[PDB]
Amino acid sequence: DPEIELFVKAGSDGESIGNCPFCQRLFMILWLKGVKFNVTTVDMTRKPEELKDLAPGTNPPFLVYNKELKTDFIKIEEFLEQTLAPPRYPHLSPKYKESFDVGCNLFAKFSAYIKNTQKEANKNFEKSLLKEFKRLDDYLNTPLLDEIDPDSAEEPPVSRRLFLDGDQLTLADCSLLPKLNIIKVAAKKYRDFDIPAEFSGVWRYLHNAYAREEFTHTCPEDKEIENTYANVAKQKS
């Protein structure tokens, strides 16, 4: 294997894994590739010391691959998917771009919702979030074009696939799952929001996903997520 060290955001104690969904994204990618790697946390309250190195534009997440520094979010993902490739490593890119797009819109609506300072606007922001969850629910319940149901074969009426793009974890899941974890924790804490039980596709996905260590063991403690929104989630009225 190559020498890989992933530098992620440290939590409140300056040591634990912090709330950083792109850090978690990269953590999951490395785990799913099956490559040997280390994860080091960076205490962003001690930048002069922790930011070694440097090149001032270096900020977590960043990664050192055989001594080469790699930076800037998606560029790191692209490099890893390219370099850790078959025959030796598994291909993780999803077949369908839509598997990405459904996740980015959802997190944006949550962000608007959790940052809304006007309690009187809560109904609209909540409806907005729910509508995007319904989009995700629909995506997860609608069979993909290449989908073969294990029990009923091709062209099934409803989807029972495990994950966004099929039955294997892909980059699309590495993007969305950390964000879904954030939404679930933060929205419950600060808006008493639960993801509706009626969204059976979303819940099927969550159950499948929380059964995979690659996701659950890369999550920060819930309180790190709660800490992120402690100030911005305060409302007028």
UniProtKB/Swiss-Prot annotation:
Keywords annotated in UniProt: Chloride, Chloride channel, Cytoplasm, Disulfide bond, Ion channel, Ion transport, Membrane, Oxidoreductase, Transmembrane, Transmembrane helix, Transport, Voltage-gated channel
Region Required for insertion into the membrane, residue ranges: 1-86
Gene Ontology annotations of biological process type: chloride transport; regulation of cardiac muscle contraction by regulation of the release of sequestered calcium ion; regulation of release of sequestered calcium ion into cytosol by sarcoplasmic reticulum; signal transduction
Residues given in the record as glutathione binding sites: 15, 217
Region (C-terminal): 97-237
Membrane-spanning segments: 22-42
Molecular function per GO: chloride channel activity; glutathione peroxidase activity
Activity regulation details: The channel conductance is regulated by pH.
Membrane topology: Single-pass membrane protein
Region N-terminal: start-end pairs: 1-84
Listed InterPro entries: CLIC (IPR002946), CLIC_N (IPR053823), Glutathione-S-Trfase_C-like (IPR010987), Glutathione-S-Trfase_C_sf (IPR036282), Glutathione_S-Trfase (IPR040079), GST_C_CLIC-2 (IPR030253), Thioredoxin-like_sf (IPR036249)
Localization per record: Cytoplasm; Membrane
Region of interest (Foot loop), residue spans: 141-161
Residue numbers covered by motif G-site: 20-23
EC number from the UniProt entry: 1.8.-.-, 1.11.1.-
Tissue: Expressed in adult and fetal brain, heart, skeletal muscle, liver, lung, and spleen. Detected in adult stomach and testis. Expressed in fetal thymus and kidney.
Record region (Joint loop): 85-96
Record-annotated GST C-terminal domain positions: 66-229
Any GO CC annotation of this UniProt entry: nucleus
Disulfide pattern: 20-23
First-level EC class: oxidoreductase
Function: In the soluble state, catalyzes glutaredoxin-like thiol disulfide exchange reactions with reduced glutathione as electron donor. Displays weak glutathione peroxidase activity. Can insert into membranes and form chloride ion channels. Membrane insertion seems to be redox-regulated and may occur only under oxidizing conditions. Modulates the activity of RYR2 and inhibits calcium influx.
Domain notes: Members of this family may change from a globular, soluble state to a state where the N-terminal domain is inserted into the membrane and functions as a chloride channel. The redox status of the active cysteine in Cys-X-X-Cys motif likely determines the capacity to adopt a soluble or membrane-inserted state. A conformation change of the N-terminal domain is thought to expose hydrophobic surfaces that trigger membrane insertion. The active G-site has a dithiol Cys-X-X-Cys motif which mediates glutathione-dependent redox catalysis.
Subunit field text: Monomer. Interacts with TRAPPC2 and RYR2.
NCBIfam families from the UniProt entry: O-ClC (TIGR00862)
Protein name: Chloride intracellular channel protein 2
